[PDB]
Amino acid sequence: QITTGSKELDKLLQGGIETGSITEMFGEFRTGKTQICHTLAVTCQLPIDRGGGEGKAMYIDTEGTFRPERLLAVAERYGLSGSDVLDNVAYARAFNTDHQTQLLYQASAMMVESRYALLIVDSATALYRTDYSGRGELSARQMHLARFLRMLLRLADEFGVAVVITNQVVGNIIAHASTTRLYLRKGRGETRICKIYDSPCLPEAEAMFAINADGVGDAKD
Amino acid sequence: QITTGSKELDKLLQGGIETGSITEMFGEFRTGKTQICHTLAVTCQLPIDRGGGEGKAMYIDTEGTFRPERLLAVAERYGLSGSDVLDNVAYARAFNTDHQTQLLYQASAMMVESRYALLIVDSATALYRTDYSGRGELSARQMHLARFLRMLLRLADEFGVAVVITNQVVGNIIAHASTTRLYLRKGRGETRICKIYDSPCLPEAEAMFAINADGVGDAKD
Amino acid sequence: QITTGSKELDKLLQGGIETGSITEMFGEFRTGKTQICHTLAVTCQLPIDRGGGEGKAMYIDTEGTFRPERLLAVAERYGLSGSDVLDNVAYARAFNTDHQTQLLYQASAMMVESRYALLIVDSATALYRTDYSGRGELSARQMHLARFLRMLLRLADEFGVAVVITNQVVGNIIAHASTTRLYLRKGRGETRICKIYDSPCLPEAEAMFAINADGVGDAKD
DNA sequence: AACGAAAACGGCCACCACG
DNA sequence: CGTGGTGGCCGTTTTCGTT
Numbered sequence A, B, C: 001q002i003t004t005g006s007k008e009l010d011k012l013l014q015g016g017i018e019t020g021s022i023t024e025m026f027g028e029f030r031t032g033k034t035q036i037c038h039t040l041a042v043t044c045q046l047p048i049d050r051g052g053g054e055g056k057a058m059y060i061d062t063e064g065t066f067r068p069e070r071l072l073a074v075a076e077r078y079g080l081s082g083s084d085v086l087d088n089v090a091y092a093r094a095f096n097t098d099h100q101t102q103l104l105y106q107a108s109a110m111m112v113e114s115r116y117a118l119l120i121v122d123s124a125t126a127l128y129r130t131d132y133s134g135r136g137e138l139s140a141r142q143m144h145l146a147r148f149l150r151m152l153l154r155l156a157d158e159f160g161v162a163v164v165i166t167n168q169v170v171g172n173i174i175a176h177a178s179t180t181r182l183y184l185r186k187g188r189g190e191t192r193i194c195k196i197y198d199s200p201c202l203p204e205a206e207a208m209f210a211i212n213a214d215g216v217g218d219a220k221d
Numbered sequence D: 001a002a003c004g005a006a007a008a009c010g011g012c013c014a015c016c017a018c019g
Numbered sequence E: 001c002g003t004g005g006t007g008g009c010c011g012t013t014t015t016c017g018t019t
Helices: A007-012 A033-043 A068-077 A082-087 A097-113 A126-130 A138-159 A173-177 B007-012 B033-043 B068-077 B082-087 B097-113 B126-130 B138-159 B173-177 C007-012 C033-043 C068-077 C082-087 C097-113 C126-130 C138-159 C173-177
Strands: A022-027 A056-061 A089-093 A116-122 A162-168 A180-186 A191-198 A206-211 A216-218 B022-027 B056-061 B089-093 B116-122 B162-168 B180-186 B191-198 B206-211 B216-218 C022-027 C056-061 C089-093 C116-122 C162-168 C180-186 C191-198 C206-211 C216-218
Touching: A007 A191, A007 A206, A007 A216, A022 A033, A022 A138, A022 A173, A033 A056, A033 A068, A033 A116, A033 A162, A033 A216, A056 A097, A068 A082, A082 A089, A089 A097, A097 A116, A097 A126, A097 A138, A116 A138, A126 A138, A126 B138, A138 A162, A138 A173, B007 B191, B007 B206, B007 B216, B022 B033, B022 B138, B022 B173, B033 B056, B033 B068, B033 B116, B033 B162, B033 B216, B056 B097, B068 B082, B082 B089, B089 B097, B097 B116, B097 B126, B097 B138, B116 B138, B126 B138, B138 B162, B138 B173, C007 C191, C007 C206, C007 C216, C022 C033, C022 C138, C022 C173, C033 C056, C033 C068, C033 C116, C033 C162, C033 C216, C056 C097, C068 C082, C082 C089, C089 C097, C097 C116, C097 C126, C097 C138, C116 C138, C126 C138, C138 C162, C138 C173
Parallel strands: A022 A162, A022 A180, A056 A089, A056 A116, A116 A162, B022 B162, B022 B180, B056 B089, B056 B116, B116 B162, C022 C162, C022 C180, C056 C089, C056 C116, C116 C162
Antiparallel strands: A180 A191, A191 A206, A206 A216, B180 B191, B191 B206, B206 B216, C180 C191, C191 C206, C206 C216
């Protein structure tokens, strides 16, 4: 179980993400999906006794929001070497849906030589909206997304890593494929509300957390 | 941080625009978006110790409002050579959305040979309204705008320059992409009210400034 | 500053029209736009010490309202030779928007050989409504008007002449291009109310004037 | 008796207003 | 900002008139 670094969120998840499965967090923009991704990108490298996976991180960005400085802040919060964190995070920006899936081909071969624990795909659904904008082409983007999700599941079962994808809510296919769906909504200021909206094992429940300069971290009224 | 040349606005932004990110200023017509652009087009060339970026400026105009004389006024205000300011500002008028995006192809290659600090796109959303006026073609202009914004983010991360685009409020996609949204409204006479309407780091707050012959400059009751 | 020949209007404008810039007067029909044009067509020829520009006049008519006799009346009011006034006013009626813009080609070359101070375009927006009456052709007339306005600004900067265009209010593009917007409304009888509705330098303010056989001239209760 | 044109009705889309 | 309602425009079908 990879620690989220929010204790309340860890309790909500019973200790953190299950490696080897896809966890989807759907919420409005600015809810902190990207911030949680940046935090996990570092916490994954933490020792297992500290809630990490003792593995490198993979950040596939489609939205430009990748900040190595956020990774440095998370590393210094938990006392990890920021330089080693950036050395254990491989980053690449996907320009389109086809490029987004093509990066998985390099990811599968690269993930064999080194132990990874986390795969991050940020604005995973944005490129299927920007690229495929027509109505007759909807089935094509749905097929590409389906294949992409199957590839995610395959890599998860192959390397035993956690698969994190982010969705902006301004597909029903992900429900059966994703094991845990988390709904994120803004509480005013920088403090966010998290809700579980389906889990066969986890209750439907809510937990409050905040977005702090160092971290994605528990709410401290 | 590129100085806005309004001290109150600089305080509002904590010192000025972050280079390497897109800052959107949405407001009514005649609020001073273009005036701020003209001021920044010169202030960017200022020394870093003076709040500049020590880089050349790029003005992509779609509305005809480009005035080299305004640049000369800003240069003489801060004591910069007006001729050198015009020599460090490359200007081109986009005739359509396709031409607006096509100019980015020349911009990316040209921005490699010389250091730039500011990219200005004035009436950035006007051409998507004048060109794409139908209702069935809305998705096409939205896709073109999405690609344009992604190109802006790519150039920002590539050259570490500030990306400034102006929007007339007589898209929701820009919210996640733009880092700082500023709402501009008219105070009567030539003095304008600025408000921050989203920033993960900057407070929602307001600052009063004026539009002076020399400058975009602090309000002086 | 070209005298309007109304003292109250001159005070409203701080002495008269700035040459080298476009001044737009928007108002209802019969408010006196054409009358003001006829008056200025003669006052421009007045000595600079008398509020003129010591230059010839250019009247481009689209509405048939051109009256040389009104020019003769204005000339005799200020004591100018009516025959020389008509000799210093070149007149041409535009039959369409394309012809209206085409006349500018003859105007630019003709304005080089002799000094002019005033360019008048009467019912400037009427031909874009009579010619382009459909809804799909709106962008075409807007583009033609935009190019026409840019040509006006170019000629203004080239010859340092005043650019006067008249608009019947039974485009938002002119706002940034026009420097001074004047709203004209009828006071009953022949006495008209003038209001300034935008000027970066001139206050929003009003002045009362009348339309007299000799002149456009101050209100005399 | 057949074909073409005109008029009327219905449905869909867009814009405006209200919550 | 989103949803619902109303109005306008366009397309299709039916009926009538003319060849």
